[PDB]
Design an enzyme around this catalytic site. Sequence first.
Site, PDB file in Angstrom:
ATOM      1  CE  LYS A 197      -2.624   3.110   2.674  1.00  0.00           C
ATOM      2  NZ  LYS A 197      -3.585   4.137   2.185  1.00  0.00           N
ATOM      3  CE  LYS A 208      13.317   3.556  29.036  1.00  0.00           C
ATOM      4  NZ  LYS A 208      12.103   3.755  29.868  1.00  0.00           N
TER       5      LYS A 208
END
Lengths: 492, 124, 122, 122, 126
Positions: free
Chosen positions: A22, A121
Amino acid sequence: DPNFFKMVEGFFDRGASIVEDKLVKDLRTQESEEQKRNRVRGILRIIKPCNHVLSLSFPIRRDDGSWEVIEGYRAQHSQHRTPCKGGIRYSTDVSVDEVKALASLMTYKCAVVDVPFGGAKAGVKINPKNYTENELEKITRRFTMELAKKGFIGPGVDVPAPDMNTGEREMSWIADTYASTIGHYDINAHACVTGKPISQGGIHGRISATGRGVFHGIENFINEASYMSILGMTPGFRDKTFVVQGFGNVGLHSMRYLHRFGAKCIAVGESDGSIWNPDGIDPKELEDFKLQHGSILGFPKAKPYEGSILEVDCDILIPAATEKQLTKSNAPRVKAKIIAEGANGPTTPEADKIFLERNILVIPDLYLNAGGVTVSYFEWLKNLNHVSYGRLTFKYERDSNYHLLLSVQESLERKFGKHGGTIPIVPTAEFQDSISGASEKDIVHSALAYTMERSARQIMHTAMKYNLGLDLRTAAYVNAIEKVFKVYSEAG
Amino acid sequence: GGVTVSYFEWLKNLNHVSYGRLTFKYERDSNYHLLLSVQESLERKFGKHGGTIPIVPTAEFQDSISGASEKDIVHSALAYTMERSARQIMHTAMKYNLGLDLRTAAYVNAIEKVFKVYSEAGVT
Amino acid sequence: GGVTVSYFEWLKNLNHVSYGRLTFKYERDSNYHLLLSVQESLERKFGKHGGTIPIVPTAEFQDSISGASEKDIVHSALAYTMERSARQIMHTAMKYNLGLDLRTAAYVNAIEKVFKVYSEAG
Amino acid sequence: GGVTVSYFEWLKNLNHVSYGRLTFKYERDSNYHLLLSVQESLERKFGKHGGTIPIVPTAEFQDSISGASEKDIVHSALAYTMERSARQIMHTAMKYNLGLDLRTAAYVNAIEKVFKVYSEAG
Amino acid sequence: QGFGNVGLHSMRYLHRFGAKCIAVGESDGSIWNPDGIDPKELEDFKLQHGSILGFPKAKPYEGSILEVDCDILIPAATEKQLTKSNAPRVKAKIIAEGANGPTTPEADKIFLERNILVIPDLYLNA
Ligand SMILES: [Cl-]
Ligand SMILES: [Cl-]
Ligand SMILES: [Cl-]
Ligand SMILES: [Cl-]
Ligand SMILES: [Cl-]
Ligand SMILES: [Cl-]
Ligand SMILES: [Cl-]
Ligand SMILES: [Cl-]
Ligand SMILES: [Cl-]
Ligand code: NA
Ligand code: NA
Ligand code: NA
Ligand code: NA
Ligand code: NA
Ligand code: NA
Ligand code: NA
């Protein structure tokens, strides 16, 4: 069973193979469909690994006069949207691979709730119980100093957040250090970190943000017939039994908002025990009991449960504690039909396979566990706006609402020739509370509900499009990957 | 039972049309319109994103709809008559403490009904 | 269709009443009771926190309720007659293997009907 | 109001049967069939059993079913007549700018009705 | 006690020959009806919903399934269901062991002193 870094890369590769064709269709570059697939597969090769990882080794001085070198790391997974966002962990079990994994998870989590932040993080290798409060401040501030000069903290580069063994107290030291040293000339210096106290520039409604996010995450699927039909339950929250695992910050507000809508909490379990009561547990009574003695063991209006909290016969299971609590061992024995992941990756990929086979709804973490990250985006905007939400509009809106109700009153009194006060138009009991108690918490909580609801439609749509059924995780990762891809593709 | 239906046959010949011929489909479409109203209302509330909540008649209701004949209206009216007349007998029995003497309860009921027609009509 | 409805006009003059004059409001109120009964029962089952569950007629149902006239009953009875009479022609054409000869099936249908009234009358 | 019901009494004596005598149970059994159809259609979808989703009539609808009399029909038909007639009175009062002169609007409508029977008869 | 395979056919064959089933219990719950439970209707309900709770022709029974007042009791489930502590509280005069070892030897002692006929497993479950 496997390390979490092996999981996120598997979730990415599964979603990348489904959304691949897609992406090639909607890609409108000046190439053929063969070179476009090279760009799609090429951009996906950039998003998967972390872009920057800063390994640190800074010194602190203990109160006893000794010297100690602290080790810390911070990974920036994606820079497709600046700044970067992510938490800071103060644990001994912290490794680089565990940091890069949760950094990649933050990227896809932010994309699900449409938060324009790159995933990051951090984590230093200490145990906070072995350090005093003054020693923890020196570690925090020096860590902030080292991240600043290496481009790993700042309002437009990287905005950290709290995590395990880390609260609003550490965020104060982080914002104070940056606003006094490297970012002194920065007008938005206090936007360099989120989760701050209200006095240091925090946002209201942050304590109950993640707890309210897991409620609206279940609510958006508990009210959809097509998903509740696959399970053996009727839509709604009335007489719904749910179990909370880990009575922490998320677990406390999770049971409070579920109990408010009619759900009955039959069991709460932590690391030191588990209580049980099929007739419901009061969240306020258990919250005051947890505060007094630091544990839920020995609750008067409940009975001890000598068994697995995750295998309790119920309807909704909310893991809100540690990682990888539902593995291939205990997952075939789970009695719940809805699993709301109140933590970051508490279900192994192998347990996801049999959960989909057993027809058990698993709401994923990168969507459901994004309530705090959504208002962390709101706190970052608040520091950029330099004003609380509604400070300039509360009285203006309240006077407009009273003007609207008075316009109906006077128009009807004039239509029927009645004097003033004959037809009083007053707000309802619910509207009166929303008017008198209007605060910044009310706007950010409604904004959180808007985000969780809108993201649920995007997950339901793409899951229905790819016939994924109850595989909400794959549909979520397909949404995040497609969003990050469009930012890369439409840039060059 | 047959006498009650014989009364219905006398009315059918006076009406010059069987029972339900004018209304069978009008009520059939109304029933399907009520169930479809609950279906679209529930889909609007709980099925906003895919999925239908089909509201279909039961097995006994679908038989009453597909196989709707004048016989169904007659026998339903017969049960209505036998139910109401039974309660009239039970009321008279407990009124005069007749107990299990239902025949005396029935003859008292019949005599009272016939008398009120004669009495309220007047003789003079 | 005109012949069938002329039968209804003949019956109406015998009834000295229009179709629906005695029952239009009774049907309208009972249907609004049924929808409210499903609503009052579902809101009790799903609680009040999830919001109200409004059950309202469909667009076609609302038009059929508000515009209730004698024409609606007449046209429904006409459709009922044309539907049932079609099943009789299809049944007779299949029993005698007439295929697409619906006309012949329609005449044996009528001849059999007129004969039965003549026969059992003696 | 009494004149309207007196019209129904004349029709009742022509029908030689009370109103609802042959349809009270048929309509009541259908009212319970519609509610049970909704109940069994939801318990089947969400995998429930027995009376997990009870769908009962409202207290007002229960009074409608319990104790349905011929009185209920003629009062509903009287309400249907007084309502529709009220709209016909408001319509020509607005058309002829009669304002609060409802008596004139009523006589204008009656005269027009009586006239139409004469004119279209010859 | 236990509507698995043995309890299903034990109820089917007893009801066929005049007996009447009053209560059926499992690890999920217990149904009860003093005027008889149909085995065929219960078999189709157990096969459909996967359990027996919510039977339309049987009210729930929140008490012990082994202590239901009846004439015959059929344990057809787990080992050691009748125990010294619960033996003096049973009401049936005949205990049809439709499972292997459902009675403790101490419960056998109470059943013997109370004139309760227990048909052993090595004969009935054969
Ligand atoms: Cl292991
Ligand atoms: Cl330092
Ligand atoms: Cl299962
Ligand atoms: Cl700005
Ligand atoms: Cl005033
Ligand atoms: Cl007032
Ligand atoms: Cl689906
Ligand atoms: Cl009385
Ligand atoms: Cl006549
Ligand atoms: Na409550
Ligand atoms: Na695994
Ligand atoms: Na598939
Ligand atoms: Na007549
Ligand atoms: Na009396
Ligand atoms: Na003759
Ligand atoms: Na006027």
